[PDB]
Design a protein around this ligand. Structure first.
Ligand SMILES: [Mg+2]
Ligand SMILES: [Mg+2]
Ligand SMILES: [Mg+2]
Ligand SMILES: [Mg+2]
Lengths: 133, 37, 176, 23, 126, 134, 188
RNA sequence: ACCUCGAUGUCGGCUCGUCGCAUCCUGGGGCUGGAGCAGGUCCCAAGGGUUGGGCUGUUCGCCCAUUAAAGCGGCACGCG
RNA sequence: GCCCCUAAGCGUGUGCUAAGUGGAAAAGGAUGUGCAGUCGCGAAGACAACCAGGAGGUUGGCUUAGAAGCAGCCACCCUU
């Protein structure tokens, strides 16, 4: 079992998932189509797949929620994060957008209410070098 | 089988025993086998 | 100490005869004997079990107590159940067979090697690459198993050689 | 070397009070 | 156990009680080691099960409004608490009593109202 | 390597090493110090080696104090000349150290790490010593 | 501020000889000169003295039971040994049952400054004046959030009631400075 | 410079050997960045062997053919 | 000095010595042993043994074809 943060609009990226899961014996031809048919709906958000190994070499990709670390990039507008925590800033994010990303991530985080769901992303942003305003 | 007057554990799960007349260290990694002498 | 202070549960079908320091045990699998250390005293409790006692707490007695206790425990256990060590072979072209009472191994050598089963021990085979030694003396069984294991040089690159039942040897890798 | 070492060490004996001629 | 363990277990149980929807206490004295698998292994994923000594539950139960359970701490206490829905855990603990006949039931706590063995059964079936 | 900027006398008479250290016994600046136990000269080369070892074992932080400075010269006669001539020129500088005197002190916070650094340092010295705490 | 009891017997012979003879058997000599009084040479148990010291030592107060005669004294210095660590000889002064006395007290830092900063204790002792029992056994100085070059002096230390600082308020007790880099370490 | 200048004849080469292994090989074993051959390192082991020539007195050293090897030292830098 | 040589005690009470240390020697290494002085825990069941667990954010960014927990620095966090 392993979970990687692979882009949505991209297809068949070798460095990230070339030998990661392919070496375990799971095919990639049908996986590419199953990923594209599901990512063409959003076309604007990264989707991390939770690779779940099976005994019969089958594969049922889990359509999890987007990653908070990467959604922070879209919230701040820049793709490259900061270089030092609590020392540099990239941009400001709105509380409404924070609540929206928390609602979308409800199905992945261990939080219970919107408050904690957004506070987890706030702590992630604190560790990465970004604060919410 | 390193043979030096000084011996210390290089592995992480090592025991240092006292043999017939010499000390030794025991760990799975054969590279860490050392004897005093 | 922690082990020698405990008793030895003797099964029903066992005859234990204590003669001073010496001791003998008779069971279904056979009969064995042993000699306990002088600073330790062996005694048969009222419940038939055996108990080793030390008069002092010196290093010698503390080290011999558990030793003798486990020795007599294995002695009484062998006559009732006996010991059996199973071994398996790995590597193409390797074969083992039972000829009469001895064993014949062909492990790539120009000629086959023979191992004569000594007294008090027996061999058996369940597959051309799977055999098992059996006996009463745990020491003899272990010695025979170690000899059969060291028969061949330990080859980690391919694991070709002899191995115990649940053996797990290290394995290197040859890039070319 | 060994000769002088022994000559100097035999002075340490407790029968001569730790003193001998020629070191 | 060590005093550090005694001090960390009380905080652990406090966190359990503050982060869980409810908690049920049972008597686990009488089981060997081999049981702990069909125990926690299949429960810790969605639910959670913890065990400790009596001296720690008295210190841990003095946080929330569960003072009424002071007299309900007779004997060893093993606590079980779900991370999501509690109806499944209630049904499981109810059927375990009839399956094993060794897990004595005493009651629980809901909205500050302590429930007895008969009151908890009125909601365990619903 | 440490060396006096200037000295009043070029040659000395091998300062004696005996007695017990009167001053510089207890650690003052740092928190963990190294206290020697055998009287013997310590060379600027050894001092620099110990300092380099400490600086390498402690990176990106910590401070080190050296309460000993090599100022006592010691000469080295010609390569293969005979006995009897003007006293040779000073060839290495040392510092007369007596037992009980502290030589190096550390300010690295983590105990284990400071102790390991002091151990690696003492391992580079020619005399026996131990670690002391403030 | 509670006195620690201890027994002591008047020594019958002085000098380095008697001192070594007492030290061989685990005893420690001491003097009780006091304030303009007739000095008294006493002998205490080395183990008990070391225990009291490691418990609340460093100028601790003490109660001497000299042949049943109670006395309240205070320590002035130890001078254990250059190499070893043992109480070779002590000195005591009667406290006159509440008279104000000035003595040295040990300071200690308890805190955590910014990550890229290191603290250094330039002075470990402070001259504090207080009563016999109110003598604080230790002083504490905290550090949190301070930047580099924030020199904490003795005058900035908070002292309990009835305590006074005799040393000037300019003594730099603690100095925090930016974390020395590898270059600063190798250029020393 | 402690016997030796009212004498202890100094370097190489020939004959002759004796002893240590800090072992060149033969023998055994451990680790190897040991797939195998062929190598690197360490431990024990002196029973045995350790070539013939050109240069230069030479010791030493270089070169030519080989050789499992063309080993290091003590014995008045062995042996008039 | 008192077992033989070698005249005198294989003298007595309490401890240590497993290495012939006695009857050569250093840095350093080291679950050898005896005593005393301290500290963590410990019937509220100490440590080993045994068994189940050992995630989410997240692959923390920086660095990198590349750090995902484990070549490298920074801080070294919230939920369960
Ligand atoms: Mg003559
Ligand atoms: Mg050899
Ligand atoms: Mg022979
Ligand atoms: Mg010729």
């Amino acid at each position: 079992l392993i979970k990687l943060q692979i882009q949505a609009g991209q297809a068949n990226p070798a460095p990230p998932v070339g030998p990661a899961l392919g070496q375990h014996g799971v095919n990639i031809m049908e996986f590419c189509k199953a990923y594209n048919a599901a990512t063409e709906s959003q076309r604007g958000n990264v989707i991390p797949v939770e690779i779940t190994v099976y005994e019969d070499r089958s594969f049922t990709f889990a359509l999890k929620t987007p990653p908070a670390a990467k959604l922070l990039l879209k919230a701040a507008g820049v793709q490259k994060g900061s270089g030092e925590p609590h020392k540099t800033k990239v941009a400001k994010v709105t509380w409404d957008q924070v609540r929206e990303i928390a609602e979308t991530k409800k199905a992945d985080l261990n939080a219970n209410d919107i408050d904690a769901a957004a506070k987890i992303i706030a702590g992630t942003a604190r560790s990465m070098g970004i604060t919410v305003e | 089988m390193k043979v030096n007057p000084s011996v210390k554990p290089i592995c992480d799960k090592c025991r240092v025993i006292r043999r017939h007349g010499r000390v030794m260290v025991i760990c799975s990694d054969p590279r860490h086998k050392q004897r005093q002498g | 100490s922690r082990i020698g202070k405990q008793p030895v549960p003797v099964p029903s079908g066992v005859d234990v005869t204590i003669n001073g320091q010496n001791l003998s045990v008779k069971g279904p699998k056979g009969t064995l004997t042993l000699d306990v250390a002088e600073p330790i005293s062996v005694s048969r409790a009222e419940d038939g079990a055996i108990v080793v006692t030390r008069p002092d707490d010196e290093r010698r007695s503390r080290s011999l107590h558990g030793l003798s206790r486990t020795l007599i425990a294995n002695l009484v256990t062998g006559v009732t159940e006996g010991y059996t060590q199973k071994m398996e072979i790995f590597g193409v072209g390797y074969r083992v067979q039972l000829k009469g009472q001895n064993l014949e191994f062909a492990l790539g050598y120009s000629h086959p090697v023979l191992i004569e089963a000594p007294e008090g021990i027996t061999f058996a085979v369940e597959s051309p690459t799977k055999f098992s030694v059996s006996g009463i003396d745990k020491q003899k069984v272990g010695q025979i198993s170690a000899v059969i294991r060291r028969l061949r040089r330990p080859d980690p690159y391919k694991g070709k050689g002899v191995r115990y039942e649940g053996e797990q040897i290290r394995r290197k890798v040859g890039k070319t | 070397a060994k000769r002088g070492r022994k000559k100097r060490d035999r002075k340490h004996s407790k029968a001569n009070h730790g003193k001998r001629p020629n070191a | 156990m060590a005093k550090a363990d005694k001090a960390t277990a009380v905080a652990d149980i406090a966190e359990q009680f503050k982060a869980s929807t409810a908690t049920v206490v049972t008597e686990y004295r009488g089981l060997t080691v081999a049981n702990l698998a069909e125990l926690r292994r299949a429960l810790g994923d969605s639910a959670t099960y913890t065990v400790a000594k009596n001296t720690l539950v008295k210190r841990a139960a003095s946080e929330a409004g569960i003072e009424g359970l002071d007299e309900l701490f007779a004997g060893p206490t093993a606590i079980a608490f779900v991370k999501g829905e509690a109806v499944d855990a209630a049904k499981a603990i109810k059927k375990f009593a009839k399956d094993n006949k060794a897990l004595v039931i005493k009651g629980g706590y809901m909205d500050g109202k302590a429930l007895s063995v008969a009151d908890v059964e009125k909601i365990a079936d619903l | 390597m440490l060396i006096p900027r200037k000295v009043k006398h070029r040659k000395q008479h091998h300062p004696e090493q005996r007695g017990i250290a009167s001053g510089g016994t207890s650690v003052s600046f740092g928190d963990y110090g190294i206290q020697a136990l055998e009287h013997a000269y310590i060379t600027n080369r050894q001092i620099e080696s110990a300092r380099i070892a400490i600086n390498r074992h402690i990176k990106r932080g910590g401070k080190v104090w050296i309460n000993i400075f090599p100022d006592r010269p010691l000469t080295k006669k010609p390569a293969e000349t005979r006995m009897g001539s003007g006293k040779g020129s000073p060839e290495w500088w040392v510092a007369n150290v007596k037992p009980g005197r502290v030589l190096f002190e550390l300010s690295y916070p983590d105990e284990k790490t400071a102790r390991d650094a002091l151990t690696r340092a003492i391992h580079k010295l020619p005399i026996k010593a131990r670690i002391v705490t403030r | 501020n509670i006195p620690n009891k201890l027994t002591a017997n008047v020594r019958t012979r002085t000098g380095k000889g008697a001192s070594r003879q007492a030290r061989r058997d685990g005893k420690v000599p001491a003097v009780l000169y006091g304030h303009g009084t007739d000095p008294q040479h006493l002998e205490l148990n080395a183990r008990d003295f070391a225990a009291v010291l490691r418990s609340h030592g460093t100028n601790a107060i003490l109660t001497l039971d000299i042949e049943g005669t109670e006395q309240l004294a205070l320590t002035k210095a130890l001078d254990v040994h250059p190499i070893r660590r043992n109480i070779q000889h002590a000195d005591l002064l009667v406290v006159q049952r509440g008279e104000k006395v000035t003595v040295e007290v040990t300071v200690l830092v308890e805190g955590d400054a910014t990550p890229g900063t290191l603290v250094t204790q330039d002075a470990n002792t402070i001259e504090i004046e207080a009563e016999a029992l109110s003598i604080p056994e230790q002083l504490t100085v905290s550090v949190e959030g301070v930047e580099a070059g924030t020199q904490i002096t003795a005058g900035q230390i908070s002292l309990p009631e009835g305590v006074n600082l005799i040393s000037d308020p300019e003594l730099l007790v603690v100095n925090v400075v930016e974390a020395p880099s590898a270059e600063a370490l190798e250029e020393e």
